[PDB]
Design an enzyme around this catalytic site. Sequence first.
Site, PDB file in Angstrom:
ATOM      1  N   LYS A  20       6.610  -1.898   7.554  1.00 61.69           N
ATOM      2  CA  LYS A  20       7.676  -1.306   6.757  1.00 61.69           C
ATOM      3  C   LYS A  20       8.845  -2.257   6.874  1.00 61.69           C
ATOM      4  CE  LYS A  20       8.360   3.068   6.673  1.00 61.69           C
ATOM      5  NZ  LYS A  20       8.467   4.552   6.816  1.00 61.69           N
ATOM      6  N   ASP A  66      11.427  17.990   7.644  1.00 57.53           N
ATOM      7  CA  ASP A  66      10.867  17.694   6.323  1.00 57.53           C
ATOM      8  C   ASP A  66       9.336  17.664   6.312  1.00 57.53           C
ATOM      9  OD1 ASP A  66      11.068  17.328   3.551  1.00 57.53           O
ATOM     10  OD2 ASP A  66      12.126  15.406   3.708  1.00 57.53           O
ATOM     11  N   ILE A  97       0.824  -1.218   0.000  1.00 58.91           N
ATOM     12  CA  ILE A  97       0.000   0.000   0.000  1.00 58.91           C
ATOM     13  C   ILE A  97       0.861   1.272   0.000  1.00 58.91           C
ATOM     14  CG2 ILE A  97      -0.265  -0.099   2.531  1.00 58.91           C
ATOM     15  CD1 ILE A  97      -3.160   1.190   2.002  1.00 58.91           C
ATOM     16  N   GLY A 124       8.968   3.662   0.026  1.00 60.38           N
ATOM     17  CA  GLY A 124       9.474   2.487   0.722  1.00 60.38           C
ATOM     18  C   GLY A 124       8.707   1.217   0.389  1.00 60.38           C
ATOM     19  N   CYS A 125       9.162   0.092   0.955  1.00 60.88           N
ATOM     20  CA  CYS A 125       8.426  -1.182   0.882  1.00 60.88           C
ATOM     21  C   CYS A 125       7.511  -1.284   2.096  1.00 60.88           C
ATOM     22  CB  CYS A 125       9.387  -2.364   0.831  1.00 60.88           C
ATOM     23  SG  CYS A 125      10.778  -2.067  -0.273  1.00 60.88           S
ATOM     24  N   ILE A 126       6.219  -1.081   1.853  1.00 61.28           N
ATOM     25  CA  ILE A 126       5.213  -1.011   2.902  1.00 61.28           C
ATOM     26  C   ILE A 126       4.060  -1.938   2.510  1.00 61.28           C
ATOM     27  CG2 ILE A 126       3.692   0.521   4.206  1.00 61.28           C
ATOM     28  CD1 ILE A 126       5.642   2.831   3.620  1.00 61.28           C
TER      29      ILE A 126
END
Length: 317
Positions: A47, A153, A24, A25-27
């Site tokens: 994550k 950020d 749904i 980075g690798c998440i």
Amino acid sequence: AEQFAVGEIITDMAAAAWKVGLPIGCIYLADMNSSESVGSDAPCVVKVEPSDNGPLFTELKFYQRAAKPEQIQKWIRTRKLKYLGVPKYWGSGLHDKNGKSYRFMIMDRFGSDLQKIYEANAKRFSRKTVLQLSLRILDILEYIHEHEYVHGDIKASNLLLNYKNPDQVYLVDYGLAYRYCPEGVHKAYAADPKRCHDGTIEFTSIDAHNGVAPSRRGDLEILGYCMIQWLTGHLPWEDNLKDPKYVRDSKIRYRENIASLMDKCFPAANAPGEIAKYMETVKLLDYTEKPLYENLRDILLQGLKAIGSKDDGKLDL
Ligand SMILES: [Cl-]
Ligand SMILES: [Cl-]
């Protein structure tokens, strides 16, 4: 490379069991271990990154130090908040696959980011929306600052809505967050050799542009640029983002003369008064100085008065 077999059960360092779902980075979507599959309405995400990934380690440390569910809840109760937009940490661990070592972290799942919604509203948020967003961002910033971290950020793509409540906004992405005050020892006015990152160029602080480590005033400065971007669709330096020295020069000159920034961004027209006041108050902060967050919130509360409204927690998105 695939890090999980969909539907497998992963066990964290506290021995809590979770099941892995679709991306749904690798998440990936995640839920508690049960007989059911992980569905599209899952309340968590996992994550996962290689164990040598710096940002996920930094992020995990932030979450473990400052985002424990009962730590957040205590703060909510003692400061009398409706909620706090720091996502909750649910666990973490180490996961081996195909001879590679991965780190994983379980956290709250969210709805849409604000940048999607901003672009669907033709790159405007209303004054009501901006004041309500900013009040909650100030709650978040005060919290993280009091727990020794700055974000560096803040921007609409890092602001996510509660999955079940679209009037609650959360600040995400601590992979590049900075511990400005470890054990109460404020960092010196200088570059940190361990930190490469400068934030997102259109929003970042003058401190960042000068190559020093981010501090509390920097976060508040970033939020200031976000407010202008949200209210107007623009920032003055937006056509020069490939040229950092221009962006810095512009921010420095505009900080020295805030009335000229207001004339630039709200042209041939009155500027909403709270925004200039917000920026004047942030300008007074030294690098190491603790902000007066309540005064900043008062400035925004006066803006709500001015438009016939109040802090009713409604983001009007
Ligand atoms: Cl605490
Ligand atoms: Cl436009």
